[PDB]
Symmetry: D2
Subunit: 370 residues, 4 copies
Amino acid sequence: KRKTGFFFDERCFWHSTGLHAVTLPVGGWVQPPAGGGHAESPETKRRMKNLMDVSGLTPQLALRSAAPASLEDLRRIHPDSYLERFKAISDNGGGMLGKEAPLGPGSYEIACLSAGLACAAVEAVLKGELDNAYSLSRPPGHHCLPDQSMGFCFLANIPIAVERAKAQLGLGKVAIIDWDVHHGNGTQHIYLQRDDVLTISLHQDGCFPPGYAGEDDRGVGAGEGYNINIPLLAGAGDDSWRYALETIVIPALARFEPELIIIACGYDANAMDPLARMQLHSDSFRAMTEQVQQAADRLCGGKLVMVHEGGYAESYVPFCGLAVMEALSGIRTEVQDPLLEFIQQQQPRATFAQFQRQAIDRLAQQFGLQ
Amino acid sequence: KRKTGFFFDERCFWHSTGLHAVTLPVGGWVQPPAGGGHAESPETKRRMKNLMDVSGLTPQLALRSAAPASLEDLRRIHPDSYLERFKAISDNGGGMLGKEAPLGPGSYEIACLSAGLACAAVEAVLKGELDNAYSLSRPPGHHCLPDQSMGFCFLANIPIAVERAKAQLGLGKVAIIDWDVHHGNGTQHIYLQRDDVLTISLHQDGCFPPGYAGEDDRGVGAGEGYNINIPLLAGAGDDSWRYALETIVIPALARFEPELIIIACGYDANAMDPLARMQLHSDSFRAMTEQVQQAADRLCGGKLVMVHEGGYAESYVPFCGLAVMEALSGIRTEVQDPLLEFIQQQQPRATFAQFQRQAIDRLAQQFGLQ
Amino acid sequence: KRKTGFFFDERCFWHSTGLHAVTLPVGGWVQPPAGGGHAESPETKRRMKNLMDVSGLTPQLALRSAAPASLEDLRRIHPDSYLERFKAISDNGGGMLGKEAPLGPGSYEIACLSAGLACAAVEAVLKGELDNAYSLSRPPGHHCLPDQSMGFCFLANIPIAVERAKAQLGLGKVAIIDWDVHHGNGTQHIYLQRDDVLTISLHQDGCFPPGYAGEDDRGVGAGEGYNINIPLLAGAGDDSWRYALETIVIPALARFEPELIIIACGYDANAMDPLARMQLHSDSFRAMTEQVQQAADRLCGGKLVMVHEGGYAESYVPFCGLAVMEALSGIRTEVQDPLLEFIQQQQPRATFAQFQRQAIDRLAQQFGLQ
Amino acid sequence: KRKTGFFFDERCFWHSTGLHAVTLPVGGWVQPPAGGGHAESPETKRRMKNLMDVSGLTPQLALRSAAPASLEDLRRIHPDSYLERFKAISDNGGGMLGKEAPLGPGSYEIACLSAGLACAAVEAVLKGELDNAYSLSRPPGHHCLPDQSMGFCFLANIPIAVERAKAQLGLGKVAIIDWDVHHGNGTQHIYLQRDDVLTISLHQDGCFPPGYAGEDDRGVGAGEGYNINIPLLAGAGDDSWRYALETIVIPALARFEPELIIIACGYDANAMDPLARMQLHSDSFRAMTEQVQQAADRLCGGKLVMVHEGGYAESYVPFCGLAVMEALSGIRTEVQDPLLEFIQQQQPRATFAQFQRQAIDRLAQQFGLQ
Ligand SMILES: [K+]
Ligand SMILES: [K+]
Ligand SMILES: [K+]
Ligand SMILES: [K+]
Ligand SMILES: [K+]
Ligand SMILES: [K+]
Ligand SMILES: [K+]
Ligand SMILES: [K+]
Ligand SMILES: [K+]
Ligand SMILES: [K+]
Ligand SMILES: [K+]
Ligand SMILES: [K+]
Ligand SMILES: [Zn+2]
Ligand SMILES: [Zn+2]
Ligand SMILES: [Zn+2]
Ligand SMILES: [Zn+2]
């Protein structure tokens, strides 16, 4: 039983992005949705917190909100031209911030709050106030480029908190493991030429950004060797993701020797997600958390911070997030994941599992870890 | 430009199945859904018809409803013990018809209507009134066992229409191709010992029924060799599904020589579906329809009937169904699928594509077609 | 049994107006809605048509769509400055057309189609092709001022069709009876100085526009005496509305002697509506339709056109609209309104009923009809 | 600034009641709803709490949950025959508990929790731990008869807490003021023959139970004179409700001299509610709370407990509940009710206001208070 922080704020559920039919904007041949719909609905994140409450887990955590990330915090990552336009659209009722980047009224302040939850979670663990922490950051961060919103992300949540910790708290080497099912292209770009931040992405081959695999992009200049892309095959499930972690991610952590491990923790690799094609269940996320926590215990005194990213299965993500918080806190509630046994039966058979293992083996060899 | 029937009835959208959070029943650890949700929502089927209307396709089709399947029709497939319990629950306001089989008030009559749309679509094509036909049958049929509801299905839609056509219209050999992403276990079971109906299922390996692949189940007795299961790898997309059709399904059709080809046409292999993990787009469904229509032209005077099964991506299924109706009617509207290019970029790379091709090749060899 | 036209088009259900929590725009202290919500949802209008289908009424009507109102049609009512801005916002993806006037992508074309359904319904009845007609016009029209959108209305549906009929079909005197629960301020303004169009509004005192009663606004110049406002007391129900019709509206019709009677037919006086406080049920709307149809038989050869306006009780409006179409067509289906008896019991007692009767009596005397 | 308790539990939002189209059950002529809908959705209560959080009010309150009401607690009000059937249906997955009484899985435990929140709120104020308290009890209580569920209510929340306080805490005279817009028939029945509990209901004449006004039902036996029904006219607004309070309710409180004042606090008199026809706004509820709090200060040392009942305007109830909590706590947030000015303009004009005042005057005279 560890002292585990949970950083969240009701306001993060109020960020809106206009009318969508799942991911499609309304208009032309896309009929308006009759009820809910839009993928980045707050309901997925809210239902996770709701389940944490009814399970009795919440009162055993250190609950916190946070001051929003300041303008100085944002400027470590994003140029003023981007921030001023983001704020302008937000200030004027919402609208488009470039193609496929809809935001709502006050989304600017809410995005800053989301980034601040990450900032505070990182600071608390580094100072030793908490053993580990989870930040329920909405909107997400890991696709956000310095000057371009992408994939529902408007600020670079994890990079903002990292650069803050580097300027204010003397943070050294840090590893960012991104197991959101989509490529962490924002994190990758920001740290591409830097050897002080090790960026690792496990992602469905070609999912988002579309067509990007990226195993050959290892970083540039001083950063060469300090970026790792693991494009897993669409359809992969529990065995494949855990194999990738233990075979590539953990050995990379051991070679890098970080002061802190941050997870870009998306759940959209879950077996019901509409936005990707992987077959993970709640125990998959439970095991992956155990793997990185134990690495944290060996490498940086257990210092581990997880920042929420994606996840779009409204009824199933809550069980995956509870599993992560149970593993992170070391507290097991009475909740049994009602789809666990079902998804276990759906797992790829041994021919696929071994084919995927081969491919992970080649990646490990390509990255100098085998 | 063919004379294409479209069989549908507003009442089929009124069948309900109680409260669900996507697929999970409400209760215990499953929070009630705040808005829409439940997977077998009518909205997916309605949005397809709506798009057919606004695209201008609908008036160029032969629109029809149908008389419901009669009690005699149902009795060719289902025993009275099952039918009487189904009707009893339906008559008393809805409820459970065995584990995981929720139905609503009047679901019995609506299920009979759904089966009747299939009955009529088959009869019209056989009589030469239409060149081909599509039946928007809701609730679906292909998981329904004679005495057990499964997978949202309460009557065996396609088998009921087939046995009707065999008793009333002298129908001989027929092939049923099931490209709903889940295994057509209901069709398979009903015809397992029969050589007059060739049953073929393309399905995600192990998806539903969970854990079932089934390549080795070829039929029994006189039916041995007349059932074909193609368990494709989760994650497979456009290349893999079309390869399976041309490599296994078409050659099997040519050897069997049917009088009629019926498609169990589900769309849940689409790249956004929450209930499976395949990567098909609208052109995938367009090409598969072309493949089976051209087979129909060579083998049974173009006689082709498609019966709607699954499909749970509420914004994307409509574009897939429009594509099928465009291919089936030979009429192309102005509608461009707004996600086509996106999903094309997400397709598995050549290593997976070739691995899956190998596996299809082994299946073809196992089935005596190579 | 009359030849009754029903003018509708699926596209009218696709007009959207952004994100709303019932009537409130999202932002500030207004949390985004978790599911459906926004008042001018298409679902109310769609559920009426759906019920018409399942009841068996639809095939006994003359179903039609219409060519959209042309730019010349719109210019009889609206100045180019307003139309060009409306089209500009619509053409650029939707947005605000002045304060509290949100519209969506393509709303311009859909509004023109809505107005065209009214245009065609009026033309068919005038030419004697139909005995009477109903136009399911969405978006609504009766609050639209020449140069200002108001109350969900972006074009003046009924005035556009009237002026079209006056220029193309030699239409003379016409009476417009508006029993939408809100004041028909758009119709009133357009015809304020004209004696060739008699405009009558029954509306909840002060509801919308807010604070407007209007009994003393009788028209201006040549139009003085040709506008009639009946501000009924919030809470009034079946007795009060029918009394107002027979006591003020019918006698006014008899004195004016119209060539055509058009109903601005809103249902938001229904006993469940969130946007007003009246207690009407389906038989109330059935009786009001009978009253105006019989007036039409006496005054203008039965020529009666009804144009859909408001109505925001998603489960109850469909029964009210069916009732109107049953009365209009002279066809009674098997449908019994499941809330009729309930709402009948909720009706104001005799003290209120008589107080409201007194007030109607004073209005009748004020208008020279008693 | 008072010490104000707020009793709530996430589990109360999980009680479900099956599929409804607003208030209508699905089936027959009632089409299933496409999105949200059903009137007793948790969203109304949740959005109030959400707004309390984002406004900054919540941390200034004493937040509490409660132990559920025990079986002994329930038995002070309800017979075992009713409780055992309620629990049986709840234990078996939900279903009907008599006509028009749908409940869901585990609704029994959740109803007990709802009643326990009321029990605890009453106990805390009586013991002097809090100055006043609000209980966010869902499901509601005030229509529940001892042996019959009615109007969304399955246990008699306020009577259960009262009888508990009378047996365990020596509670004497108590007054229950019910300003939910519907008649508190459950409270009335339970205390009909008792002079130790004064029951007062302000309600829309004839709304629910339908057709019931009840001014002449004053209580029976020893209870005669200790029940007060104020059937206000549908359509009444701010002036009328406040006049009734000051003219009938406050003088009745002063004559009775209670030890405690409990409000059955429903918000469905709000000007947007689908289930009644009154025109109250947030300041109306703010003023009514002030009136009863000041009475509490004069009569029973400020001891005031409010228990949540109805309220079905999903976007507007939250502003009314915030207003009540602001008045109750003596803390004003920055939130301005965005519809206040609008609803103020909709208020009945002076003719109605004076007519309603007359009727209240007669009631006051009938009850011996003028
Ligand atoms: K995405
Ligand atoms: K790097
Ligand atoms: K990733
Ligand atoms: K299924
Ligand atoms: K067979
Ligand atoms: K299949
Ligand atoms: K309005
Ligand atoms: K006029
Ligand atoms: K009106
Ligand atoms: K009620
Ligand atoms: K009493
Ligand atoms: K009341
Ligand atoms: Zn993602
Ligand atoms: Zn399927
Ligand atoms: Zn209206
Ligand atoms: Zn109520």
